[PDB]
Ligand binder design. Structure first.
Ligand SMILES: [Mg+2]
Ligand SMILES: [Mg+2]
Ligand SMILES: [Mg+2]
Lengths: 233, 196, 125, 212, 222, 226, 204, 195, 195, 196
């Protein structure tokens, strides 16, 4: 049993017709202190998977090393390490899920909420969630922390059920994600303007976008707002 | 919350962010923490919103009734009425208030009233959760008898840093200028102050 | 200070008359005429707006007053006494009825409450 | 819960209710509170849990191993002590158990052992365990004799569970009867309390307080 | 303090027919007031004509189902591909659950299938492994809303035959698979109306001698 | 609960879901959360349901008396001031979280009030367990100079986000539009996207199914003459 | 410890075609101990019926109180109180004890004498009104009653059909609750006749 | 105190009440009468917290005796029980509540019927054929359920009461030092001095 | 369990031990023998937490019986008491201590003297003329202090013991359902079947 | 405690105050918080003195044994050994360590290791109770590739403010310069830095 110290906030994600999108801001908070502004919380595994991690950053860095070690180990005595016997999103997730539940069962959890986004060998979209309790679930849209409360509602207006996935293009999906990130910046007191976005497409592969910023923000209306009730000036 | 009041040559300027949080959720991102108790006596509020509003409303009432009988009150008088409420009800209040005002006789004055209910007259005052991160900056950069433009830059740069580091602070930087000329409101948006 | 008049100012005279009530009725008699007529599908109340000066805006002085959405009142006698009674009558319709039953009082019961206020001024200290 | 068991001329009568509650919520009306350890031994289930189920079916495994090794029926004294020694090892851990280990052997005759999760092991003639035990005890104590018939003894146990089922909120559903003889236990049926109550009320003239 | 348990909501329902069995469960997965997934399968085919669902804390539920499925696999290896009977599966599950008696699987488990005589069977487990064969069992969030309805409409409790006035009970006539599925659907429709954690979708697994069949139905998504 | 308020061109609109819950159980599937303080000042309530109703009736009553006293139509700021001072006095023990909106001679107004007595001003607001879902929608689609038709659409879309995604909210969407120089229009059950589907079976029992012990006529009438 | 579930008991009310029905169990207990099988929880003031679950001392106290208030109402108004008005009175009375409440779950039922409209309402312990068209439930087996009512109920039932529905709803709910049962009463209410029926149920 | 029983038979009400008074580790008295006569044909037995029991019982007694003098009339057992319930219902929401449970056994001279009322410290009143407070009911009610008839004689009621006391003496851990039995009928209140 | 007494007279040791076994609210048994014979001339009575009492008593019994067989010799009461004390002294600092108090009454055949040892669950041993555990001593010791003589006969010891039991039956709140009395002398151990 | 490490053109400089308090009592006013784990790899310690000393001693042992086998370790390697101890024993440690070092290949590097056990490579790092007050100042005044004299002035001015506001910090300002030239210790007394 511990308490999280340096933390990362929401990770948001959604499926679209040819793959998955995942995003997460570049902030490492220290309570209310916005301590570290250059923290990458999307960690790609191979060219077909991206693991998005929220929660305790020291535990994230540990998970990061486990995945880095997983790739090394998979290459051992494996001539098809870059082909048929390469790591799948479903393999990477199940491994993490096992670890997360084992750790909670020893009463010493990895204080995280993880979303594994990727594309399988047969082109199928993979998107599944796991957290410090070892609880797992899959959905057309997945989000951690504040994202669950604010991002999902917006992303679910695009893909409300399974049958909406083939109707959703990568441009529409990315637009929805980028908008959700803006909404979180408005409303999450432990978020940052800078973020990273990753697209895993079955055709174009892994596109990893760093140093993105929330833009097109509405603030002008603030000038008109005065006092808290009766004040006019 | 990040709030500050700074005296300068022509008078005094109050500055504040606009973020009000309930835990990590931002309940209001366009809050007006600069509140008016008299024509040229304003205050910056920090702590319990319910408490600081309730206090400010009562002070405004007291200074309105004071003006009806004894004419315009001093900034010191306003600070005393704030103090009297905060001190006598310290057990049931979580209020950190900076009082700033402009007389013609006394010119710009700033009084800070922390949790205890004590009063401290200062050349400038900083307060709120985000103030902790700018004690160093403000101390190094403050000068007495600054110009209006210098004081706006001092507050803008200061609150910019407070906002940058404090998660509890954010949104727009509101300011209110108090001089003989009158009362001027200023607003500065994220795109402006973040790049400083 | 303190209200040291804790005794009745209205008392029975040897003949069994309550003087102050009779004199109050004399003050009502001097007052401007007002009337009321009940129809099968409505009631009407009316009075003369006796303007104290032509410079005065008699629209501002309301002799006929709404008590509840379905109850109205008019008077004859001392206007100020009426004005305060209307204020008390409006409040008592809320405090002793609407805030309990979630509806406005019937005419007779509001009248009863007004009567009770006037009776107490006839016996209280 | 209400479970009772008493020794008499014709062996042992075991009677239990059938209700299982989680707080005010009635989880089940069809619970088996008599474990059939083996064809000659019975155990009751009061205490709150799986603990009696799990450890008394385990007891049946130990009794089977005993008579395989020793070529002889295990005594009720030995069987009950295997259980009491086991739960005593778990003392403090939070096991919740209150059972009567009932049997009829040559060397002992009819024997009942109260076994407890605190490690208590008592031999006795009449035992009552559960939230409705006090109600069952009332009927038992005032009507018990050693020279009861198998027919009357069976009824007494049934009526005593009914008495508890009525008053105790956490007991009811149905009554399970058993009669333990030297040649083994004999099941004497499941009796719905709802139907049994009206039947008993009319035939016995009891429960005059209740309107039927 | 770290709390190793959670509540993922959901509700499940097992009903044993004369020569069949059904195990139904809603597809909604939740935490607190948030929906995690509108379709997260909860009832599983574990092989050997057995269906299982471990409702409550999803992590422990998934762990138990995984371990039982694994137990079926090793039963085949160790005992010459022998079919695991429903009664044997039930006893095996008790030991899996009681194995963690002092740090329980926080789930209310139900399995369904056919007994060795071909009749319908349902077994019901508490978190620590106490179990019993039952004709009817709802489990999870809206279990309290469903069981009373089932006592009335499956076992005909409190129902008597008109004219006799309380003297003759309604006879316990057998229900067809089509008749059971109607009661299952109406149970979940009613549960969805009055329980916030129940909704989105209903997935029913029907077990017969022919094998396991699935049926899905929409539920209200509010 | 999901409640929202949205300002527009010539007035303000408020909206709310219609689910009231006791723990995880739905007590009322068509609850009315839009309360009238005065004819053109309406508010929506979240938190302790009795407190929200009770506090709006009390302030509504005093507002009516004040309106009669001053011969002036009531103001939103008066309702706001009276509410906050009452709530502050009881320091959150009265668990009323309100969104107050309305029109008066001063103009159109929109405020929020929290149980401890704090108030906020805004063009768009949301409160209750589904406020984050609703606020997400408002932040994504709100703009300055909304029309009446756009604000109703936005407000109801924000409530829907709560209905679907928040378990504390559900059923129907109530809306009230308060436009300047007009009567406020209360749109009870403006949307109805959650009608229960027909059941598979009718559970109407055969008469005489229930067992009875005694029958009798109850005397509801008064004591009779003669 | 929990005041609302010491004594136990339930009340359910339903609407039908030109009729309402209200029903209750008869159990009073001290937690596990059954104490009385004649503790009726439905009362009436003129043609308005009030069921009350929860702490028994408050059930008794509130009945006595509403009798008191409806009697004075009648003397002053010169007419019997209506269900809609009484509901508001119940709510008012409960909320005046906001920070020291009666631990009860009241249920109003009746037919408006003037309009003939069937009316039912429910409250929490603090006075919040739940005015449902279909049905109201209250007590220690309210979850069970919600489940029963939700599936069994259909609108516009005739009085003698409604009796069967509300009876089966109560009985089967009470049989899944340890603190309810020990008998049951059902009132069938029409505009100018009321039939009261005691039900035969299991006594455990 | 500990055990108080009550049973209403054909023509009388019988109240049994323990004699023991234990304060901590010692039994200070073994002859304590836990009852007060409220009026000639109404008796109230009581059990609860020390001090509160007698203080309450005597307070009720004084109030009923005051009513009897003022009106020159004996209140009905029902009326007395309603008065007593209200006092306890008022008490429970007080600064310091009375922690007292009572049984009110009376004979209504108007209706010529015996009446037994059971009221706990919360103000929970119930009219019963037989009643008890505390753990007394747990042992006795099963016997009373079985044997009780509404047309029992007073001698039969006492025999059924002896069977209850015997069961209490057998299965209760506490030694309550026997019971004082009193009968309430048309002729008034009298004590059974041998039991 | 509850009350266990002991008294060493001229030529014997007498141990009295209650018969009641209460588990919560009910008295499950009224004939329980809270003693074990460790050797032919050594008896140990015991009282403490449920389960622990018998488990401990039987464990000691087995160990002494093992010693008796191995050496073909009976240990002295002193030796047995020292063994028992050590086990309890070891126990008190264990993971889960035995919660058992004992009295060891024995007749030393070598010295031709009766001996009574009192040992509590902590391993606090004392040799006494008369002893008790729990609240038993509070009531009885004043009587024993007054009447006891070292040259008392066994019949006088029993009379003094009856006076102790009577005082316990009078002033103790708990009904301990009487006592089983056993005498330890040169001829061995025997039970007084009428008491 | 007020500690910081700053990279510059020629390498890196570590800076620290010298105050160690037990409550409000200053147990040691001349503490050396700049501690050496290798020739040109040093660290700044904050938190539990017992813990940070115990860690630093173990690290020094590990880097000594590393050097015996594999030659001079990298600054990254040193930070990893610190992290491994801090992360794996997070439940029993209260240590906030800044690791700074100079390679010839990598030049000046700074790694901060906060309570959690996470590692963060940064251009400069600040830590300790007093660091809170200079987040604003340091952010505004830091530049990359400063000179030795500029970096000394930056650290001196920064820690001056931290000391001024933080009661837990005080005494002398110690510094250690790490360059290709070697290892240079610097000390600055109250009379010098207070008047800045
Ligand atoms: Mg910020
Ligand atoms: Mg029962
Ligand atoms: Mg406050």
């Amino acid at each position: 049993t511990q308490q999280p110290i340096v933390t990362g906030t929401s990770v948001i994600s959604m499926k679209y017709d040819n793959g998955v999108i995942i995003a997460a801001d570049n902030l490492g908070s220290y309570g209310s202190l916005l301590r570290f502004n250059g923290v990458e919380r999307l960690i790609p595994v191979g060219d077909n998977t991206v693991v998005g991690i929220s929660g305790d950053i020291s535990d994230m860095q540990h998970i990061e090393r486990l995945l880095k070690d997983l790739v090394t180990e998979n290459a051992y005595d494996n001539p098809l390490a870059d082909a048929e016997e390469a790591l799948e999103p479903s393999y990477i997730f199940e491994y993490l899920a096992t670890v997360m539940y084992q750790r909670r069962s020893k009463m010493n959890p990895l204080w995280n909420a993880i979303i594994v986004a990727g594309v399988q060998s047969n082109g199928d979209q993979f998107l599944r969630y796991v957290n410090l309790l070892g609880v797992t679930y899959s959905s057309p849209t997945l989000a951690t922390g504040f994202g669950a409360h604010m991002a999902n509602p917006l992303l679910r207006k695009v893909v409300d059920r399974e049958s909406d996935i083939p109707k959703t293009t990568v441009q529409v999906a990315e637009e929805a994600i980028v908008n959700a990130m803006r909404v979180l910046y408005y409303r999450d007191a432990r978020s940052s303007r800078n973020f990273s976005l990753a697209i895993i497409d079955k055709n174009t592969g892994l596109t990893f976008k760093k140093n993105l910023q929330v833009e097109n923000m509405k603030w002008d209306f603030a000038k008109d707002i005065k006092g808290y009730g009766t004040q006019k000036i | 919350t990040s709030i500050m009041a700074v005296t300068f040559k022509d008078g005094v300027i109050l500055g504040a962010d606009s973020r009000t949080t309930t835990g990590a959720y931002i309940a209001n991102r366009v809050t007006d923490k600069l509140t008016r108790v008299h024509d040229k006596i304003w205050c910056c509020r920090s702590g319990s919103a319910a408490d600081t509003q309730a206090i400010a409303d009562i002070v405004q009432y007291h200074l309105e009734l004071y003006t009806s009988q004894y004419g315009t009150p001093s900034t010191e008088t306003a600070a005393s009425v704030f103090k009297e409420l905060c001190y006598e009800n310290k057990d049931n209040l979580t209020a950190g208030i900076i009082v700033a005002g402009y007389d013609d006789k006394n010119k710009g004055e700033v009084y800070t009233i922390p949790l205890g209910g004590s009063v401290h007259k200062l050349p400038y005052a900083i307060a709120g959760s985000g103030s902790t991160f700018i004690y160093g900056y403000c101390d190094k950069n403050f000068r007495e008898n600054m110009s209006k433009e210098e004081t706006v830059d001092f507050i803008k740069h200061s609150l910019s840093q407070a906002i940058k580091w404090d998660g509890s602070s954010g949104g727009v930087i509101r300011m209110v200028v108090l001089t003989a000329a009158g009362v001027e409101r200023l607003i500065f948006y994220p795109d402006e102050y973040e790049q400083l | 200070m303190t209200d040291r008049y804790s005794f009745s100012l209205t008392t029975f005279s040897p003949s069994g008359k309550l003087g102050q009530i009779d004199y109050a009725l004399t003050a009502v008699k001097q007052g401007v005429t007002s009337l009321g007529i009940k129809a099968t599908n409505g009631v009407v109340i009316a009075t003369e707006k006796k303007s104290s000066s032509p410079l005065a805006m008699s629209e501002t002085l309301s002799k006929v007053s709404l008590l509840t959405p379905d109850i109205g009142a008019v008077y004859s006698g001392m206007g100020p006494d009426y004005r305060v009674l209307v204020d008390k009558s409006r409040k008592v319709a809320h405090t002793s009825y609407k805030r309990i039953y979630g509806e406005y009082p019937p005419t007779k019961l509001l009248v009863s409450e007004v009567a009770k206020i006037m009776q107490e001024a006839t016996q209280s200290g | 819960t209400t479970t009772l068991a008493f020794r008499f001329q014709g062996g042992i009568i075991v009677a239990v209710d059938s209700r299982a509650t989680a707080g005010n919520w009635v989880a089940s009306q069809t619970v088996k509170k008599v474990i059939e350890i083996n064809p000659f031994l019975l155990g009751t289930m009061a205490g709150g849990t799986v603990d009696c189920q799990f450890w008394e079916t385990w007891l049946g495994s130990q009794c089977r191993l005993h008579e395989l090794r020793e070529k002889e029926r295990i005594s009720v004294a030995a069987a009950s002590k295997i259980l009491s020694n086991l739960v005593y090892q778990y003392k403090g851990a939070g096991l919740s158990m209150g059972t009567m280990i009932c049997g009829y052997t040559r060397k002992e005759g009819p024997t009942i052992y109260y076994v407890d999760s605190d490690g208590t092991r008592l031999k006795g003639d009449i035992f009552c365990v559960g939230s409705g035990q006090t109600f069952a005890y009332g009927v038992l104590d005032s009507n018990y004799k050693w020279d009861l018939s198998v027919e009357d003894a069976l009824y007494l146990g049934k009526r005593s569970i009914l008495a508890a089922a009525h008053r105790d909120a956490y007991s009811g559903g149905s009554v399970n009867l058993y009669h333990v003889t030297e040649d083994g236990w004999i099941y004497h049926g499941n009796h719905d309390v709802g139907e049994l109550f009206w039947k008993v009320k009319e035939e016995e003239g009891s429960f005059n307080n209740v309107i039927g | 303090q770290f709390n190793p348990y959670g509540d993922n909501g959901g509700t499940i329902l097992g009903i044993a027919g004369e020569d069949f069995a059904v195990l139904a469960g809603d597809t909604r997965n939740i935490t607190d007031y948030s929906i995690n997934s509108r379709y997260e399968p909860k009832v599983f085919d574990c092989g050997d004509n057995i269906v299982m669902s471990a409702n409550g804390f999803a992590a422990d539920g998934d762990a138990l189902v995984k371990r039982f499925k694994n137990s079926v696999k090793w039963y085949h290896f160790d005992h010459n591909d022998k079919k695991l009977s429903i009664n044997s599966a039930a006893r095996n599950i008790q030991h899996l659950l009681y194995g963690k008696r002092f740090f329980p699987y926080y789930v209310h488990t139900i399995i369904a299938g056919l007994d060795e005589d071909g009749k319908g069977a349902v077994y019901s487990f508490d978190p620590v492994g106490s179990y019993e064969r039952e004709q009817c069992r709802a489990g999870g969030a809206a279990a309290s809303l469903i069981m009373p309805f089932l006592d009335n409409q499956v076992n005909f409790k409190n129902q008597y035959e008109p004219g006799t006035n309380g003297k003759v009970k309604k006879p316990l006539k057998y229900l067809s698979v089509e008749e059971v599925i109607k009661l299952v659907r109406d149970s979940f429709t009613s549960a969805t109306e009055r329980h916030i954690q129940v909704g989105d979708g209903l997935e029913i697994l029907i077990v017969t001698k022919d094998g396991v069949r699935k049926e899905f139905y929409e539920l209200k998504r509010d | 609960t999901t409640i929202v308020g949205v300002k527009f061109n010539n007035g303000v609109v408020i909206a709310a879901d219609t689910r009231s819950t006791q723990g995880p159980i739905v007590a009322d599937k068509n609850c009315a959360k839009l309360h009238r303080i005065s004819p053109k000042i309406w508010c929506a309530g979240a938190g302790t349901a009795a407190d929200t109703e009770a506090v709006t009736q009390l302030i509504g009553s005093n507002i009516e008396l004040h309106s009669l006293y001053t011969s002036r139509e009531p103001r939103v700021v008066s309702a706001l001031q009276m509410l906050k001072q009452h709530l502050f006095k009881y320091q959150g023990h009265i668990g009323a979280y309100l969104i107050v909106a309305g029109v008066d001679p001063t103009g159109s107004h929109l405020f929020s009030i929290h149980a401890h007595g704090s108030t906020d001003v805004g063009y768009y607001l949301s409160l209750g367990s589904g406020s984050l879902a609703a606020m997400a929608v408002l932040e994504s689609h709100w703009k300055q100079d909304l029309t009446k038709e756009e604000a109703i659409k936005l407000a109801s879309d924000a409530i829907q986000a709560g209905i679907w995604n928040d378990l504390g909210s559900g059923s129907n969407v109530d809306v009230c539009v308060m436009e300047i120089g007009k009567d406020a229009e209360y749109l009870r059950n403006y949307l109805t996207p959650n009608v229960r589907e027909e059941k598979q079976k009718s559970y109407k029992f055969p008469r005489g199914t229930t067992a009875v012990l005694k029958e009798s006529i109850v005397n509801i009438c008064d004591i009779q003459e003669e | 410890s929990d005041p609302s579930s010491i004594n136990g008991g339930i009340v359910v009310a339903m609407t039908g075609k030109d009729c309402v029905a209200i029903a209750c169990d008869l159990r009073l207990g001290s937690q596990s101990l059954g104490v009385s099988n004649k503790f009726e929880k439905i009362f009436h003031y003129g043609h308005v019926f009030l069921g009350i679950t929860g702490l028994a001392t408050d059930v008794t106290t509130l009945n006595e109180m509403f009798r008191y208030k409806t009697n004075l109402y009648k003397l002053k108004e010169e007419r019997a109180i209506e269900p809609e008005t009484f509901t508001q009175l119940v709510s008012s009375s409960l909320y005046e004890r906001r920070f020291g409440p009666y631990f009860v779950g009241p249920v109003v039922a009746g037919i408006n004498s003037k309009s003939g409209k069937p009316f039912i309402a429910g409250f929490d312990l603090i006075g919040c009104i739940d005015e449902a068209k279909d049905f109201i439930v209250s007590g220690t087996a309210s979850d069970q009653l919600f489940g029963m009512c939700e599936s069994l109920y259909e609108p516009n039932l005739e009085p003698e059909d409604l009796f069967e529905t509300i009876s089966q709803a109560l009985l089967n709910a009470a049989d899944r609750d340890a603190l309810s049962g020990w008998g049951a009463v059902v009132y069938i209410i029409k505009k100018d006749e009321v039939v009261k029926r005691y039900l035969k149920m299991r006594q455990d | 105190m500990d055990i108080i029983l009550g049973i209403r038979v054909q023509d009388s009400v019988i109240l049994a009440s323990s004699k023991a008074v234990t304060r901590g580790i010692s039994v200070l008295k073994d002859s304590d009468d836990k009852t007060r006569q409220l009026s000639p044909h109404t008796l109230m037995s009581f059990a609860g917290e020390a001090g509160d029991t007698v203080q309450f019982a005597e307070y009720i007694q004084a109030n009923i005796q005051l009513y009897s003098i003022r009106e020159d009339y004996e209140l009905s057992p029902q009326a007395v029980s309603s008065f007593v319930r209200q006092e306890l219902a008022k008490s429970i929401r007080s600064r310091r509540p009375y922690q007292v449970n009572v049984l009110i056994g009376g004979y209504d001279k108007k209706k010529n019927k015996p009446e037994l009322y059971q009221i706990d410290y919360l103000g929970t009143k119930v009219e019963l054929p037989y009643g008890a407070h505390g753990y007394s009911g747990f042992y006795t009610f099963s016997l009373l359920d079985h044997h009780y008839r509404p047309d029992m004689t007073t001698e039969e009621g006492l025999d059924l009461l002896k069977l209850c006391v015997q069961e209490l003496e057998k299965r209760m851990p506490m030694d309550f030092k026997g019971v004082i039995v009193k009968i309430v009928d048309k002729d008034g209140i009298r004590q059974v001095d041998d039991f």
